[PDB]
Amino acid sequence: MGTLGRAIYTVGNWIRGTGQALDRVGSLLQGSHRIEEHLSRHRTLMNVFDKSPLVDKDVFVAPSASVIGDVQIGKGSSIWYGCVLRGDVNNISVGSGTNIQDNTLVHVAKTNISGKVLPTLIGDNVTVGHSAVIHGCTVEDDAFVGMGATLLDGVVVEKHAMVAAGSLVKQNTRIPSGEVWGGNPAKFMRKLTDEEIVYISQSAKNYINLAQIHASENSKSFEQIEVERALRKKYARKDEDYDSMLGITRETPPELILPDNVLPG
Amino acid sequence: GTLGRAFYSVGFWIRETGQALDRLGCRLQGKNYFREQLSRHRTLMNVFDKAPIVDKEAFVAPSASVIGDVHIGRGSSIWYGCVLRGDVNTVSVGSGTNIQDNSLVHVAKSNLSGKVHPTIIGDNVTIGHSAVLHGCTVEDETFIGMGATLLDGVVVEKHGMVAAGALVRQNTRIPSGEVWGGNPARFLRKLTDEEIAFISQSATNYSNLAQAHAAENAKPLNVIEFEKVLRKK
Amino acid sequence: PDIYEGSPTPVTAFLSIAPKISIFANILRVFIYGSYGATLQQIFFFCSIASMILGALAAMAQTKVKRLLAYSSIGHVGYICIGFSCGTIEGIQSLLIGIFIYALMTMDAFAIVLALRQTRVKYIADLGALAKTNPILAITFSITMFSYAGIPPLAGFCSKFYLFFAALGCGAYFLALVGVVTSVIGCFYYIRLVKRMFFDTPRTWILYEPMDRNKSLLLAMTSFFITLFLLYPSPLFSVTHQMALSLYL
Amino acid sequence: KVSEDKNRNYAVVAGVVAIVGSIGWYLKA
Amino acid sequence: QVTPSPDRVKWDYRGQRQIIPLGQWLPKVAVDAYVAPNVVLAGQVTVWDGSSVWNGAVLRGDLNKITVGFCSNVQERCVVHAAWSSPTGLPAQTLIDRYVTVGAYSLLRSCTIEPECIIGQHSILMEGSLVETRSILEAGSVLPPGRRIPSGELWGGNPARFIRTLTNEETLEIPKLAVAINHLSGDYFSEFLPYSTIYLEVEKFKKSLG
Amino acid sequence: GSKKVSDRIVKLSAIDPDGYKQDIIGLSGQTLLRALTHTGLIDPASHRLDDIEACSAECEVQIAEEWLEKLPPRTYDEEYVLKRSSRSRILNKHSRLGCQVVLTQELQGMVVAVPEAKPWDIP
Ligand SMILES: CCCC(=O)SCCNC(=O)CCNC(=O)[C@H](O)C(C)(C)COP(=O)(O)OP(=O)(O)OC[C@H]1O[C@@H](n2cnc3c(N)ncnc32)[C@H](O)[C@@H]1OP(=O)(O)O
Ligand SMILES: CCCCCCCCCCCCCCCCCC(=O)O[C@@H](COC(=O)CCCCCCCCCCCCCCC)COP(=O)(O)OCC[N+](C)(C)C
Ligand SMILES: CCCCCCCCCCCCCCCCCC(=O)O[C@@H](COC(=O)CCCCCCCCCCCCCCC)COP(=O)(O)OCC[N+](C)(C)C
Ligand SMILES: CCCCCCCCCCCCCCCCCCCC(=O)O[C@H](COC(=O)CCCCCCCCCCCCCC)COP(=O)(O)OCCN
Ligand SMILES: COC1=C(OC)C(=O)C(C/C=C(\C)CC/C=C(\C)CC/C=C(/C)CC/C=C(\C)CCC=C(C)C)=C(C)C1=O
Ligand SMILES: [Fe+3]
Ligand SMILES: [Zn+2]
């Protein structure tokens, strides 16, 4: 503060002007070839055709996800990094406690080649694996869709049914309850054991828990990010022997401790 | 050329120095805002002089990655999450062509497996969601099913169709009017005339949908959201 | 060797250099400046030969880096004490030159060791594939090893050259034979490290964290000195001759 | 308008004094 | 009922953070590794010297560790994940060893890839699966849970099957491909200074709002 | 898929220094030390390579003679390392260096005793 503070601030202004001038000169020397980085224009939630996505309070939507148009997402659901939910020509509905994994595409159609064109309906407690493609089809509650699987228009995945990782499910195919289908084209592989039904449920609840920590981290402000960076650096290593000499016990701050429901045990 | 790269390199030295000077000036004023972790994603990215040339009438989603020498024609559209990387060779997209969400159009990263082929996409082409195109040619008015993979040297002739989830092996030629699918991709049947009509009309519909999404994205960034993010506690 | 290995590595680095300088100053000013004479030079003569032989053999036995460096230092103090033994102005000068060069080389070696302790380097075999995971670090460490071996024109060649100069100056041929044999043994166990970093293809690699600025700068300067000292060695030669003379005048 | 961290300002003055005094030390020697 | 929140962020001016810490789990990136700007690394992720992760990839270490080894590459739109446990009973971390080329659009979950392997584009490696050293998977391969690719072999298909045994020249080519991809990644690494100038844009955007 | 990890898995039991028996898992062709490090029975950081030149008997295990006959005999270097690493400088006849034991299908069901860990982290 005071006169010294003001003088140092003015000198900082001069230094900033000089630095930005040097940056401009360096840009000129590069032949202006470098496209400049800019403020991020990606919108996590966007309207189109006067349709606004309806997203429940406690839904993790990763900032890099794209939720566009007429999309409804229910309680406890999670949309992960790089997901695209494009509800522009038709409706997309996601039930409660359903996870849409990273880099997944969900889309709809305005008019199919033949039959009744239907919206994309994803039920409750559904797991959809990484990089899946869901197009104009219906996934009923407690179903599992493997990573990298493709569901074409009119496909119905029934309750407690599984689509294996990597499968290509042709248009209008029906996956009956209790069966697992896979391959390209997808076809019946075998019945689902009871332990696998329990797995599907477990998948869904584990995701519900994972979504909480990811949502908490992605929503932190600049100041909290800096505070936690400093705290993480301070507690990354230890000298418990010198602490015992000092007669103190350093405790990990609670903002660095994860909840027990996401820990391996 | 070599002189251009030398000046580009020297330019980086000057720029690095100027930005460091600016950070010093901010530090003297007690500002730490340069420490903020802000995304360095660029929708269009140059690799030295190899830069994307995009037509003014083409929609490119902000989250898409266009890297190096990539040409996009009028009325064409690059959708959300798409990646187009032409650095070792070029990638060209014709007019009225849609590249759907999460698709990947790239060339061989190295010439170890031989000369790196370019990727040529003709006019009024549909490239389905999450398709992979790797150093191939896709002629006008063809259909690439979503989730399909086309390897280098492949040629998809006009009105050809690649079924969803197909794996077209290296150097395979897809003849006109034919539907190929499966892993490996094989002849399935002939294309019907209704399918040709749907190819054209779906492409024209995508160009209109592109227009709508480009207008949506071009709207000014909301300042209320900015203030909400700034004033969080 | 036990103290050097068991102490914290910065302690080991500090003990490897400074006490030698201080105690050799003491030894010069006590014995050289005093007078019982040939008996004591014979003391240091026999201890020099024993130190060279034992250091060479024991270092050849070692599989761990710290113990290898400890035994290497024992051998080198044998080489240095040969200069004290011969009892001439050039002997004192050579002892001082050896101390200075050994100190700089030891500083280089322990800067590398401390850099590698961030990933808990312990065994010589832990250096495998270092020429792949950090090429300039593997070269720098190789220059240090070749300097330790005394390969010309690296700085380490001075101690070897004087060892044989005194062997033919004081008139001692058993000493020259011992120097030849121990120098060859030393070269073997020094180039074993270079072989481990450059020639071996282990199944499991250890990736090392890059060093901090302080150690990189110190390493850079000591590496230029080790490679380029013999291009301009005049200041050290003059200052060491000055010091040798100042003991009596 | 003003830098408020007093200790930072004092450190800035100390660095400036070191630089200028070093220049003067070289110049007058 | 779907009850929304008025305060949920629709547009985040910062974009997606590349480095997502999770408690004390902080992703570790070597100073000489290229990570594309829009990549997401979360939790227990280690990216070692000379490796590269390309546009649109996601590496999520929230259930187990993820490691990308020396001079290895994870290419565009790959997703690498891990689980608490594997059906085989072996530890379920995802280990991508040295000189490994993971083709674009590949999905990896709790798999091990031994040194000097090539994963074809659009491949899937499932829980507890193992790719032994000096092996090649063709594009579009699906490796089911706990399946193994024996060393020195070429495999492919959905599901993957033995095609042929590799020649020594072919297996010699694999680290060369990894090195060439690292050389290419150097060009991208040289385009980015240590800091961006976005904060200036944020500053003027703020000033225009008072 | 006609080639599974289950084809190479070797069932093993290890008795910890407290005496409790544990069922552990390792691959054929890999070392006993790796199998022991999978569950932390031996600290992986204490023995990072499978090489005799990087061994101070941190991998040492005790095996009964019924399984010792199914292993190759100890080499001279192995016995040297074991003897020098002994506190009493005595060679235990049932001691094996875990880094030198390669698992095979013939070692299914082998019982191994893991002694108390020796200090290994040199300052
Ligand atoms: C905590 C997180 C929870 C999550 O969200 S997990 C989501 C990410 N992970 C996934 O999506 C992977 C899901 N798992 C799969 O897809 C598995 O392939 C699936 C369907 C469980 C089958 O695995 P297994 O039971 O171990 O196979 P199986 O014993 O029934 O073998 C029968 C024959 O079928 C074949 N095969 C099985 N897996 C396949 C596949 N995905 N696709 C195609 N073909 C497959 C397999 O070759 C096997 O033998 P064969 O073909 O008759 O000779
Ligand atoms: C003749 C002497 C007696 C015999 C002893 C020989 C000892 C060496 C053994 C020879 C066999 C072959 C040795 C191969 C080494 C050559 C390769 C090499 O060292 O290249 C280094 C280069 O190492 C150096 O940095 C050497 C620097 C020494 C500087 C000495 C020159 C002093 C004046 C030059 C002024 C500046 C440059 C002027 C022009 C721009 C690259 O290091 P990396 O670990 O690969 O990567 C470094 C990281 N990065 C490239 C990103 C910066
Ligand atoms: C318009 C034409 C004028 C252009 C002038 C350009 C001149 C610039 C020349 C470059 C000088 C480089 C000096 C390098 C030292 C960096 C000083 C610094 O970083 O300032 C720091 C610390 O400053 C100091 O502690 C002492 C050094 C400051 C003295 C030199 C300041 C250089 C500009 C002079 C400004 C004062 C002039 C007016 C004084 C009344 C501010 O405090 P903190 O943010 O808490 O430091 C954090 C730690 N870290 C160092 C990593 C940033
Ligand atoms: C003779 C052969 C030829 C030699 C050629 C010599 C040529 C002159 C040397 C030119 C040097 C070029 C580099 C100059 C710019 C570097 C400036 C350093 C900036 C600095 O502040 O470094 C600080 C650390 O201190 C440091 O890192 C500096 C201390 C490093 C040790 C230097 C020696 C100090 C003790 C003297 C030992 C003498 C031994 C002799 C037996 C902070 O660095 P940071 O900001 O990156 O953060 C580090 C994280 N904590
Ligand atoms: C392999 O067979 C065996 C030996 O044989 C190498 C042995 O010894 C011993 C046991 C007996 C020993 C070790 C007594 C030797 C001890 C001595 C000489 C004490 C001195 C200590 C050291 C380290 C020797 C250093 C002294 C030297 C080199 C010379 C002295 C100084 C000058 C000439 C200046 C055993 C069991 C053995 O099984
Ligand atoms: Fe061992
Ligand atoms: Zn669609």
CSV table of N, CA, C and O and ligand atoms in Angstrom, one decimal, chain A residues 99 101 127-130 144-148 162-167 180-183 189-190 196 199 202-204 206-207, chain E residues 63 81-84 109 126-127 142 144-145 147 158-159 161, chain F residues 1-2 4, ligand 1:
chain,number,residue,atom,x,y,z
A,99,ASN,N,-25.9,-44.1,-16.2
A,99,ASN,CA,-24.7,-43.5,-16.6
A,99,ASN,C,-24.4,-43.7,-18.1
A,99,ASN,O,-24.6,-44.8,-18.7
A,101,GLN,N,-21.4,-43.3,-20.5
A,101,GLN,CA,-19.9,-43.2,-20.4
A,101,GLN,C,-19.2,-42.3,-21.4
A,101,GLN,O,-19.8,-42.0,-22.4
A,127,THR,N,-26.6,-48.9,-17.6
A,127,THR,CA,-25.2,-48.6,-17.9
A,127,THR,C,-25.0,-48.6,-19.4
A,127,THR,O,-25.4,-49.5,-20.1
A,128,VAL,N,-24.4,-47.5,-19.9
A,128,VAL,CA,-24.0,-47.4,-21.3
A,128,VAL,C,-22.5,-47.2,-21.3
A,128,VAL,O,-22.0,-46.2,-20.8
A,129,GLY,N,-21.8,-48.2,-22.0
A,129,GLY,CA,-20.3,-48.2,-21.9
A,129,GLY,C,-19.7,-47.1,-22.7
A,129,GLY,O,-20.3,-46.4,-23.5
A,130,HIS,N,-18.4,-47.0,-22.5
A,130,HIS,CA,-17.6,-46.0,-23.2
A,130,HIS,C,-17.7,-46.1,-24.7
A,130,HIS,O,-17.8,-47.2,-25.3
A,144,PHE,N,-27.9,-53.3,-19.8
A,144,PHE,CA,-26.5,-53.0,-19.9
A,144,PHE,C,-26.1,-52.9,-21.4
A,144,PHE,O,-26.4,-53.9,-22.1
A,145,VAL,N,-25.4,-51.9,-21.8
A,145,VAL,CA,-24.9,-51.7,-23.1
A,145,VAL,C,-23.4,-51.7,-23.0
A,145,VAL,O,-22.8,-50.7,-22.4
A,146,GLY,N,-22.7,-52.6,-23.6
A,146,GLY,CA,-21.2,-52.7,-23.6
A,146,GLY,C,-20.5,-51.5,-24.3
A,146,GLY,O,-21.1,-50.9,-25.1
A,147,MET,N,-19.3,-51.3,-23.9
A,147,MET,CA,-18.5,-50.3,-24.5
A,147,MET,C,-18.2,-50.5,-26.0
A,147,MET,O,-18.1,-51.7,-26.4
A,148,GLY,N,-18.4,-49.5,-26.8
A,148,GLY,CA,-18.2,-49.6,-28.2
A,148,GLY,C,-19.3,-50.3,-28.9
A,148,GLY,O,-19.1,-50.6,-30.1
A,162,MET,N,-28.4,-57.7,-21.9
A,162,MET,CA,-27.0,-57.2,-22.2
A,162,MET,C,-26.7,-57.2,-23.7
A,162,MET,O,-27.0,-58.1,-24.4
A,163,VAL,N,-26.1,-56.1,-24.1
A,163,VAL,CA,-25.4,-56.0,-25.4
A,163,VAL,C,-23.9,-56.0,-25.2
A,163,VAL,O,-23.4,-55.1,-24.5
A,164,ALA,N,-23.2,-57.0,-25.7
A,164,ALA,CA,-21.8,-57.1,-25.5
A,164,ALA,C,-21.0,-56.0,-26.1
A,164,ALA,O,-21.3,-55.5,-27.0
A,165,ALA,N,-19.8,-55.7,-25.5
A,165,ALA,CA,-18.8,-54.7,-26.0
A,165,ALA,C,-18.5,-55.0,-27.5
A,165,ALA,O,-18.4,-56.1,-27.9
A,166,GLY,N,-18.5,-54.0,-28.3
A,166,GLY,CA,-18.2,-54.1,-29.7
A,166,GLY,C,-19.3,-54.6,-30.6
A,166,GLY,O,-19.0,-54.7,-31.8
A,167,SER,N,-20.5,-54.8,-30.1
A,167,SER,CA,-21.5,-55.4,-30.9
A,167,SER,C,-22.1,-54.3,-31.9
A,167,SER,O,-22.1,-53.1,-31.6
A,180,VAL,N,-27.8,-62.3,-23.4
A,180,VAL,CA,-26.7,-61.5,-23.8
A,180,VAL,C,-26.5,-61.6,-25.3
A,180,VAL,O,-26.5,-62.8,-25.7
A,181,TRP,N,-26.4,-60.6,-26.1
A,181,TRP,CA,-26.2,-60.6,-27.5
A,181,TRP,C,-24.8,-59.9,-27.8
A,181,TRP,O,-24.4,-59.0,-27.1
A,182,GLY,N,-24.2,-60.4,-28.9
A,182,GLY,CA,-22.9,-59.8,-29.3
A,182,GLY,C,-22.5,-60.2,-30.7
A,182,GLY,O,-23.2,-61.0,-31.3
A,183,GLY,N,-21.5,-59.5,-31.2
A,183,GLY,CA,-21.0,-59.7,-32.5
A,183,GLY,C,-21.4,-58.7,-33.5
A,183,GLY,O,-22.2,-57.8,-33.2
A,189,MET,N,-25.9,-64.9,-27.6
A,189,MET,CA,-24.7,-65.6,-27.1
A,189,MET,C,-25.1,-66.6,-26.0
A,189,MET,O,-24.6,-67.7,-26.1
A,190,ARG,N,-25.8,-66.1,-25.0
A,190,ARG,CA,-26.2,-67.0,-23.8
A,190,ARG,C,-27.1,-66.3,-22.8
A,190,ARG,O,-27.2,-65.0,-22.9
A,196,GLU,N,-24.6,-62.0,-12.9
A,196,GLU,CA,-24.4,-60.9,-13.8
A,196,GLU,C,-25.5,-59.8,-13.7
A,196,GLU,O,-25.3,-58.6,-13.9
A,199,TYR,N,-24.3,-57.8,-11.0
A,199,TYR,CA,-23.2,-57.0,-11.6
A,199,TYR,C,-23.9,-55.7,-12.2
A,199,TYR,O,-23.4,-54.6,-12.0
A,202,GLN,N,-24.9,-53.4,-9.6
A,202,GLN,CA,-23.7,-52.9,-9.0
A,202,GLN,C,-23.0,-51.8,-9.8
A,202,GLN,O,-22.5,-50.8,-9.3
A,203,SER,N,-23.0,-52.0,-11.1
A,203,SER,CA,-22.4,-51.1,-12.1
A,203,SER,C,-23.1,-49.8,-11.9
A,203,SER,O,-22.4,-48.8,-11.7
A,204,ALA,N,-24.4,-49.8,-12.0
A,204,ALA,CA,-25.2,-48.6,-11.9
A,204,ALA,C,-24.9,-47.8,-10.6
A,204,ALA,O,-24.7,-46.6,-10.6
A,206,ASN,N,-22.3,-48.0,-8.5
A,206,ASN,CA,-20.9,-47.6,-8.4
A,206,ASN,C,-20.8,-46.3,-9.3
A,206,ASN,O,-20.1,-45.4,-8.8
A,207,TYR,N,-21.5,-46.2,-10.3
A,207,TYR,CA,-21.4,-45.0,-11.2
A,207,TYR,C,-22.0,-43.8,-10.5
A,207,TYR,O,-21.5,-42.7,-10.5
E,63,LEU,N,-10.9,-45.9,-10.6
E,63,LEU,CA,-11.1,-47.2,-10.0
E,63,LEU,C,-9.7,-47.9,-9.9
E,63,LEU,O,-9.7,-48.9,-9.1
E,81,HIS,N,-9.8,-46.9,-19.4
E,81,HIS,CA,-10.4,-47.0,-18.0
E,81,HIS,C,-9.9,-48.2,-17.3
E,81,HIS,O,-9.0,-48.9,-17.8
E,82,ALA,N,-10.3,-48.4,-16.1
E,82,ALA,CA,-9.9,-49.5,-15.3
E,82,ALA,C,-11.0,-49.8,-14.2
E,82,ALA,O,-11.8,-49.0,-13.9
E,83,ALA,N,-10.9,-51.0,-13.7
E,83,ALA,CA,-11.9,-51.5,-12.7
E,83,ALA,C,-11.2,-51.8,-11.4
E,83,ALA,O,-10.0,-51.9,-11.3
E,84,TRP,N,-12.0,-52.0,-10.3
E,84,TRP,CA,-11.4,-52.4,-9.0
E,84,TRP,C,-10.7,-53.8,-9.1
E,84,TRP,O,-9.6,-54.0,-8.6
E,109,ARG,N,-9.8,-51.3,-21.1
E,109,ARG,CA,-10.3,-51.4,-19.7
E,109,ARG,C,-9.6,-52.5,-18.9
E,109,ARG,O,-9.9,-53.7,-19.2
E,126,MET,N,-10.6,-55.9,-23.2
E,126,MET,CA,-11.5,-55.9,-22.0
E,126,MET,C,-10.8,-56.4,-20.7
E,126,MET,O,-9.6,-56.7,-20.7
E,127,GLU,N,-11.5,-56.3,-19.6
E,127,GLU,CA,-11.0,-56.6,-18.3
E,127,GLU,C,-10.2,-57.9,-18.1
E,127,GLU,O,-10.6,-58.9,-18.3
E,142,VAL,N,-11.7,-57.4,-31.2
E,142,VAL,CA,-12.4,-57.4,-29.9
E,142,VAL,C,-11.8,-58.5,-29.0
E,142,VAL,O,-12.0,-59.7,-29.3
E,144,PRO,N,-12.1,-60.4,-25.6
E,144,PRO,CA,-13.0,-60.5,-24.5
E,144,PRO,C,-12.3,-60.6,-23.1
E,144,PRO,O,-11.2,-60.9,-23.1
E,145,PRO,N,-13.0,-60.5,-22.0
E,145,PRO,CA,-12.4,-60.5,-20.6
E,145,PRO,C,-11.5,-61.7,-20.4
E,145,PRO,O,-11.8,-62.7,-20.6
E,147,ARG,N,-8.9,-62.8,-21.9
E,147,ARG,CA,-8.3,-63.5,-23.1
E,147,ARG,C,-6.9,-63.0,-23.2
E,147,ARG,O,-6.5,-62.0,-22.7
E,158,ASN,N,-13.6,-60.2,-34.5
E,158,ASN,CA,-14.6,-59.9,-33.4
E,158,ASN,C,-15.5,-61.2,-33.1
E,158,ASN,O,-16.5,-61.4,-33.7
E,159,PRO,N,-15.0,-62.1,-32.2
E,159,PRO,CA,-13.8,-61.9,-31.4
E,159,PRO,C,-12.4,-62.3,-32.0
E,159,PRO,O,-12.4,-62.8,-33.0
E,161,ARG,N,-9.0,-63.7,-33.2
E,161,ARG,CA,-8.5,-65.1,-33.4
E,161,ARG,C,-7.1,-65.0,-34.1
E,161,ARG,O,-6.8,-64.1,-34.7
F,1,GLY,N,-11.2,-67.3,-25.4
F,1,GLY,CA,-10.9,-67.1,-26.8
F,1,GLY,C,-9.8,-67.9,-27.2
F,1,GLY,O,-8.9,-67.4,-27.9
F,2,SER,N,-9.8,-69.2,-26.8
F,2,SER,CA,-8.9,-70.3,-27.2
F,2,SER,C,-7.5,-70.0,-26.6
F,2,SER,O,-6.6,-70.9,-26.6
F,4,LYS,N,-6.4,-67.9,-23.1
F,4,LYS,CA,-6.8,-67.2,-21.9
F,4,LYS,C,-5.6,-67.0,-20.9
F,4,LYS,O,-4.7,-67.8,-20.8
G,1,LIG,C1,-17.5,-50.8,-12.6
G,1,LIG,C2,-17.9,-50.5,-14.0
G,1,LIG,C3,-18.9,-51.1,-14.6
G,1,LIG,C4,-19.1,-50.8,-16.1
G,1,LIG,O1,-19.7,-49.8,-16.5
G,1,LIG,S1,-18.4,-52.0,-17.3
G,1,LIG,C5,-18.6,-51.2,-19.0
G,1,LIG,C6,-17.2,-51.4,-19.7
G,1,LIG,N1,-17.0,-52.8,-20.0
G,1,LIG,C7,-17.7,-53.5,-21.1
G,1,LIG,O2,-18.5,-53.0,-21.7
G,1,LIG,C8,-17.3,-55.0,-21.3
G,1,LIG,C9,-18.6,-55.9,-21.1
G,1,LIG,N2,-18.2,-57.3,-21.2
G,1,LIG,C10,-18.4,-58.0,-22.5
G,1,LIG,O3,-18.8,-57.4,-23.4
G,1,LIG,C11,-18.0,-59.5,-22.6
G,1,LIG,O4,-17.6,-59.7,-23.9
G,1,LIG,C12,-19.2,-60.4,-22.2
G,1,LIG,C13,-20.5,-60.1,-23.1
G,1,LIG,C14,-19.5,-60.3,-20.7
G,1,LIG,C15,-18.8,-61.9,-22.5
G,1,LIG,O5,-17.7,-62.2,-21.7
G,1,LIG,P1,-17.5,-63.7,-21.2
G,1,LIG,O6,-18.6,-64.2,-20.3
G,1,LIG,O7,-16.3,-63.8,-20.4
G,1,LIG,O8,-17.5,-64.6,-22.5
G,1,LIG,P2,-18.1,-66.1,-22.7
G,1,LIG,O9,-17.5,-66.9,-21.6
G,1,LIG,O10,-19.5,-66.1,-22.6
G,1,LIG,O11,-17.6,-66.7,-24.2
G,1,LIG,C16,-18.5,-67.2,-25.2
G,1,LIG,C17,-17.9,-67.0,-26.5
G,1,LIG,O12,-18.4,-65.7,-27.1
G,1,LIG,C18,-17.2,-65.0,-27.6
G,1,LIG,N3,-17.1,-63.7,-27.1
G,1,LIG,C19,-17.3,-63.3,-25.7
G,1,LIG,N4,-17.1,-62.0,-25.6
G,1,LIG,C20,-17.5,-61.3,-26.6
G,1,LIG,C21,-17.9,-60.1,-27.3
G,1,LIG,N5,-17.9,-58.9,-26.5
G,1,LIG,N6,-18.1,-60.1,-28.4
G,1,LIG,C22,-18.1,-60.9,-29.1
G,1,LIG,N7,-17.8,-62.0,-28.9
G,1,LIG,C23,-17.5,-62.5,-27.7
G,1,LIG,C24,-16.0,-65.7,-27.0
G,1,LIG,O13,-15.0,-65.8,-28.0
G,1,LIG,C25,-16.4,-67.0,-26.5
G,1,LIG,O14,-15.8,-68.2,-27.1
G,1,LIG,P3,-16.2,-68.7,-28.6
G,1,LIG,O15,-16.4,-67.5,-29.5
G,1,LIG,O16,-17.4,-69.5,-28.5
G,1,LIG,O17,-15.0,-69.5,-29.2
